[PDB]
Amino acid sequence: QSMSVKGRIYSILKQIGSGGSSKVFQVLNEKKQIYAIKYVNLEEADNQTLDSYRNEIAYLNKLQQHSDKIIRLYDYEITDQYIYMVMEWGNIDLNSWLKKKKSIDPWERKSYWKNMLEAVHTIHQHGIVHSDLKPANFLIVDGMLKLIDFGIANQMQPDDSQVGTVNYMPPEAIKDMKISPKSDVWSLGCILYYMTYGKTPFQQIINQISKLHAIIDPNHEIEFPDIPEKDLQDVLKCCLKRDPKQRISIPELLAHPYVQIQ
Ligand SMILES: Cc1ncc(-c2ccc(Nc3cc4c(cn3)cc(-c3cnn(C)c3)n4C(=O)OC(C)C)cc2)n1C
């Protein structure tokens, strides 16, 4: 099986992932260069869903020139029936990687954290608040993490369609029933906490309702066990402040000893 994008032919090696009416493929061009092609079937898509895909593509296109920590979009084809998006190929998403790993190297953790801060800082500068950050939103491309979605369109699962997670959800979002660039700091904080302690802050709470209650309860103290990297411990405490006004910002996190000193 093959496909054509803007007069260029690509052969399909396999399906990497899926989600809703979209499929992600590992492909080769004519020079045998590897790419990821996202195919989106638009036949049963409404105006709200069309706008979400148009907005994602537009932000991907714009942000290319602003940071190398956003996945490269090389070409695309858009009609009334489908979307083809030609992107750079990555080895694995951060979530599948964190599942394989028994323990993480402190230097790899630090490098990954800096990439995540740079990618998220760039989207904030263009007025995007992701609000749904989790490790699966990051892709490893040549020892570097790259953001692959903006929380604007449908999420891809590597190849259960009910699968979600409340584990990275900021308290203000739950309370508001508010969401600012600070909301993404809390989610990045939960990812770093996972990379440090091997669990997310509220993972042990079984019931999802009890979990949401724990996220917003100031009386529920998050445990921060003593570790050799005192700067890392400090980053974690600053990110996971329940009050977003008290919570550290991304420009401040980029000037922190943990990211700048090694
Ligand atoms: C164990 C395991 N499960 C899944 C994987 C795995 C393997 C390879 C990849 N590589 C990969 C995935 C990619 C892309 C480029 N490379 C681009 C995308 C993409 C889709 N939409 N947008 C805007 C970008 N992408 C993607 O969505 O991957 C999903 C399946 C995790 C991603 C995940 N692995 C290694």
| Active-site residue identified among 93, 132, 149, 184 | 132
Instruction: Give me the domain span that covers residue 21.
Output: 3-91
92 lines ligand 1 (CB under 6 A): yes
CATH number for position 63: 3.30.200.20
Split into its structural domains, the chain has a count of 2
Q: Please state the φ and ψ torsions of residue 240, each to the nearest 5 degrees.
A: -100, 40
Same domain, 160 and 37: no
Instruction: Answer yes or no: do 60 and 110 share one domain.
Output: no
Q: Tell me if 86 sits within 8 A of 35, measured CB to CB.
A: yes
Instruction: Say if residue 23 carries a ligand binding annotation.
Output: yes
Q: Is 36 in the pocket of ligand 1 (CB under 6 A)?
A: yes
Which of 66, 91, 116 lies at the terminal end of a domain, its last residue? 91
User: In ligand 1, which atom is closest to the CA atom of 100?
Assistant: 1
Residue minimizing CA distance to atom 3 of ligand 1: 158
Rounded CA gap, 3 and 27, in Å?
A: 9
Q: How was this structure determined?
A: X-ray
Taking the C-alpha atoms of residue 209 and residue 228, their distance in angstroms, rounded to an integer, is: 35
Are residues 64 and 166 located together in one domain of the fold?
no
Strands 73-78 and 8-19 come out as unpaired
State if residue 53 touches ligand 1 by the CB under 6 angstroms criterion: no
Say whether both 145 and 180 belong to one domain: yes
Q: Is 19 annotated as a binding residue?
A: yes
How many A from CA of 147 to the centre of ligand 1? 11
Separation between Cα atoms, residue 11 and residue 28, nearest integer Å: 5
Q: Are residues 165 and 155 in the same domain?
A: yes
Residue 111 contacts residue 262 (beta carbons within 8 Å)? no
| Cα(160) to centroid(ligand 1), Å | 16
| Cα–Cα dist 6/77, whole Å | 6
From 148, 155, 163, mutation site for ligand 1 pocket: most ligand atoms within 8 A of C-beta: 148
How far does residue 176's CA lie from ligand 1's centre (Å)?
32
Whether the Cβ atoms of residue 222 and residue 201 lie closer than 8 Å to each other: yes
Instruction: Please state, in angstroms and rounded to a whole number, the distance separating the CA atoms of residues 255 and 258.
Output: 9
How many whole angstroms separate alpha carbon 115 and alpha carbon 146?
7
* Three-class DSSP labels, the chain: CEEEECCEEEEEEEEEEEECCEEEEEEECCCCCEEEEEEEECCCCCHHHHHHHHHHHHHHHHHCCCCCCECCEEEEEECCCEEEEEECCCCEEHHHHHHHCCCCCHHHHHHHHHHHHHHHHHHHHCCCCCCCCCHHHEEEECCEEEECCCCCCCCCEECCCCCCCCCCCCHHHHHCCCCCHHHHHHHHHHHHHHHHHCCCCCCCCCCHHHHHHHHHCCCCCCCCCCCCCHHHHHHHHHHCCCCCCCCCCHHHHCCCHHHHCC
Place of tokens 């996220």: 215
Question: What are the CA-CA distances from residue 111 to residues 6, 22, 116, 168, 222 (Å)?
Answer: 36, 31, 9, 21, 25
| Domain of residue 157, CATH code | 1.10.510.10
Residues 81 and 106 in one domain: no
Give yes or no: residues 196 and 116 share one domain: yes
Q: Which of 41, 64, 91 is the last residue of a domain?
A: 91
Judgement on whether residues 145 and 254 belong to the same structural domain of the protein: yes
Residue type, 15: Q
Q: Would residue 132 show up in a list of annotated catalytic residues for this protein?
A: yes
Q: Is 145 left (phi over 0), alpha (psi -120 to 50) or beta?
A: beta
Q: Taking a C-beta distance cutoff of 8 angstroms, is the pair 54, 104 a contact?
A: no
21 assigned binding-site residue = yes
Domain end among 76, 91, 106: 91
Distance, in Å, from the CA atom of 117 to the CA atom of 185, rounded to the nearest integer, reads 9
- C-beta neighbour count of 227 within 10 angstroms: 12
Same domain as 165, residue 116: yes
262 near 231, Cβ under 8 Å? no
Position 118: which residue type? E
Q: What number of other Cβ atoms are within 10 A of residue 138's Cβ?
A: 27
